[PDB]
């Protein structure tokens, strides 16, 4: 709560909204499906609380594959993904009961497992190789209240994407300790790095899965709140005993706005390539900037993402006495600069902060000085 | 699940939607300020949890009176009055724990007290006055795990609007017994008997309460999701304690769509009279329409409503020898004439059934004699 340095701009790397400088507004065919769906009138009524036929069927259409076989009814649709967590885990695990969260991972599991009575079990995300998982952890954090695992694909805060192995091992390890995979992937497709992307399901044979998702984070409408589960029963595991668990669960807050489903079967089918590509265009040169200048500043270690929209720097706590953690380091770095960074403890991993890349180059740029002109006083 | 007769045109009058037959929908104001909120691309990132700063501001100003004075902070913007409930609940009261329904009353309010971990005590309502409450029963009703005391008006299913002295007598209850008062008044303003309409707050001194409401049942965008928590904390038996445990909890689902909240300001502001006017005239005229043919029927007791959009006959168990139960009753109904009523069981309330009145009048009047059909042979 410091103040900045008022002799300073302040510059805020630590908020994920893309569209606060609007230099990453959506796609003006998806502001006007919107508009075509008002327009029309069709959409103002009650819906299902799992949402539109024609709403789920077109989605469920969007994220078909032989591997992965998508249906209209394995679609639920609901008000983002804080609810496409919140009812994928009241379904799959009662109070006292534990699921595999990430370290570090996004603090919302936390509020919501630990808020929903289940006590919560942290895996760990490897720094020195790509923040992949530790197999070590996972094979043996399990229990017999062990609900759940779960995945969070590209990673908020990591920066990271899974490569086209390290998933199936992953999905090895789920058949070995018999349980399902809530793959938080709201980050689908929001890769930019050589390497392609890979939905987490169409990699998977005998392992249950419920995929998370939405609008807010790849069209960039955040405050739109729409998301889908995503069911992906492989082996009957789950069936028809845990699909009614979700449409009964649903209908407590009975999921979006209606325009927004309306306007669903357009955004997917009439946004252009070229709306995509341009962002993680821009996505990829401002993490290399910002990789860069980081990785030459002395006492930082910057992770190298690969998709989503942030990346994690490690603080080198070997000739940087006077901060005794990322906390006091931020803080100090907030009030002396008026840099805004979001210190990793939140997701639960000390020593190190999070930087997020949606922010203008030439802000990325200043901000990264800024930085540097803070450790050649510190280090 | 019964079939219909095959033979003869389906009437739903149970359903709730006024935008099914497309006869109400809303005015084309509410439609553009959604376009021109679109259209700026102000409102597509994230908001407060609690709602945007001048939506909540606006919505604040839209409800204000000396007697019930509204200020910017103690209005929370949720994506419908499901929420305003849902929360509104979560905070006053824990497992274990008493609050007071209405009987009959919105099926919903048990849904959640029940799933939430409450345990419901059922007030009453009275047909042969108005379906005003029943002073013993309340009195005396409540508990050391009393938390709340729940009022609907005007009523679902009941049609009503109470009189400007029973709210006064509703709110002396209330001071004799230290309880708050979610007033769920999703149905503000939706009346056209002679008489005006009160807001239950504003006639308040001594009374914590804490008001539902939204677009869904006055601007007919049901499937929109945007309502509001009003507080009204008169007397400080709420304070900073109350308002955070909103705050926090508002954190869990983060509330409604921005486009709608966007476009709030200018819904309000812009819509004109001749849309309500226009409402409720057609409101009263079908109720009145629906209203006499029943009343006109033989076995069938139908309470006038003043407000919202139904009303409830009452079957004479005297002359139905055939049928047993309601239930049995609008379903031998449904499959002999084709007429979808609703039980009133489902409310609480056996031996009586609900008809809304926003179906088309040349509907309403073909739906009337069917049911005459029915009990000439019957009653």
Same mark, same amino acid.
């Given at each position: 709560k410091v103040?900045?340095?008022?002799?300073?701009?302040?510059?805020?790397?630590?908020i994920?909204?893309?569209?606060?400088?609007?230099?990453?507004?959506?796609?003006?065919?998806?502001?006007?499906?919107?508009?075509?769906?008002?327009?029309?009138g069709?959409?103002?009524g009650?819906?299902?609380?799992?949402?539109?036929?024609?709403?789920?069927?077109?989605?469920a259409?969007?994220?078909?594959?032989?591997?992965?076989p998508?249906?209209?009814?394995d679609?639920?649709?609901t008000?983002?993904?804080?609810?496409?967590?919140?009812?994928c885990?009241?379904v799959?695990?009662?109070?006292?009961?534990?699921?595999?969260?990430?370290?570090?991972?996004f603090?919302?599991?936390?509020?919501?497992?630990?808020?929903?009575?289940?006590?919560?079990?942290?895996?760990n995300?490897?720094?020195?190789?790509?923040?992949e998982?530790?197999?070590?952890?996972?094979?043996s954090?399990?229990? %017999?209240?062990? +609900?759940? &695992?779960?995945? $969070?694909? *590209?990673s908020?805060? @990591? !920066?990271?994407?899974?490569?086209?192995?390290?998933?199936?091992?992953?999905?090895?390890?789920?058949?070995?300790?018999?349980?399902?995979?809530?793959?938080?992937?709201?980050?689908?497709?929001?890769?930019?790095?050589?390497?392609?992307? %890979?939905?987490? +399901?169409? &990699?998977?044979? $005998?392992? *249950?899965?419920?995929? @998370? !998702?939405?609008?807010?984070?790849?069209?960039?409408?955040?405050?739109?709140?729409?998301?889908?589960?995503?069911i992906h029963?492989?082996?009957?595991?789950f069936?028809?005993?845990?699909?009614?668990?979700?449409?009964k669960?649903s209908?407590?807050?009975?999921?979006?706005?209606?325009?927004?489903?309306?306007?669903?079967?357009?955004?997917?089918?009439?946004?252009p390539?070229?709306?995509?590509?341009?962002?993680?265009?821009?996505?990829?040169?401002?993490?290399?900037?910002?990789?860069?200048?980081?990785?030459?500043?002395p006492?930082?270690?910057?992770v190298?993402?690969?998709?989503?929209?942030?990346?994690?720097?490690?603080?080198?706590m070997?000739?940087?006495?006077?901060?005794?953690?990322?906390?006091?380091?931020?803080e100090?770095?907030?009030?002396?600069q008026?840099?805004?960074?979001?210190?990793?403890?939140?997701?639960?991993?000390?020593?190190?902060?999070?930087?997020?890349?949606?922010?203008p180059?030439?802000?990325?740029?200043?901000?990264?000085?800024?930085?540097?002109?803070?450790?050649?006083?510190?280090?």
């Amino acid at each position: 709560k410091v103040k900045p340095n008022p002799n300073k701009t302040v510059i805020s790397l630590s908020i994920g909204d893309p569209t606060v400088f609007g230099n990453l507004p959506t796609d003006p065919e998806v502001t006007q499906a919107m508009k075509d769906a008002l327009d029309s009138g069709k959409y103002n009524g009650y819906a299902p609380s799992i949402g539109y036929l024609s709403s789920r069927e077109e989605v469920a259409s969007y994220y078909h594959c032989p591997e992965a076989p998508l249906e209209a009814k394995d679609v639920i649709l609901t008000s983002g993904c804080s609810q496409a967590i919140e009812l994928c885990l009241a379904v799959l695990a009662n109070p006292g009961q534990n699921i595999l969260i990430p370290r570090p991972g996004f603090s919302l599991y936390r509020t919501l497992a630990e808020s929903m009575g289940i006590e919560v079990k942290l895996y760990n995300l490897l720094p020195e190789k790509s923040w992949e998982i530790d197999l070590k952890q996972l094979e043996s954090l399990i229990d %017999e209240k062990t +609900a759940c &695992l779960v995945v $969070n694909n *590209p990673s908020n805060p @990591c !920066g990271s994407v899974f490569s086209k192995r390290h998933l199936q091992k992953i999905l090895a390890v789920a058949e070995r300790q018999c349980v399902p995979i809530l793959a938080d992937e709201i980050y689908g497709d929001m890769v930019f790095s050589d390497c392609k992307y %890979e939905p987490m +399901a169409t &990699l998977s044979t $005998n392992v *249950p899965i419920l995929s @998370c !998702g939405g609008l807010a984070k790849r069209w960039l409408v955040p405050g739109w709140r729409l998301g889908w589960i995503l069911i992906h029963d492989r082996r009957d595991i789950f069936g028809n005993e845990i699909r009614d668990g979700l449409v009964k669960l649903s209908q407590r807050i009975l999921g979006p706005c209606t325009i927004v489903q309306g306007a669903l079967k357009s955004i997917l089918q009439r946004t252009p390539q070229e709306f995509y590509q341009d962002t993680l265009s821009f996505l990829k040169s401002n993490a290399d900037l910002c990789y860069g200048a980081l990785s030459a500043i002395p006492g930082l270690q910057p992770v190298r993402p690969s998709g989503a929209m942030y990346l994690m720097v490690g603080i080198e706590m070997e000739h940087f006495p006077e901060f005794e953690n990322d906390v006091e380091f931020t803080e100090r770095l907030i009030a002396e600069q008026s840099v805004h960074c979001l210190p990793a403890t939140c997701f639960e991993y000390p020593n190190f902060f999070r930087v997020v890349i949606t922010v203008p180059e030439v802000m990325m740029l200043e901000a990264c000085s800024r930085i540097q002109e803070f450790c050649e006083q510190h280090y």
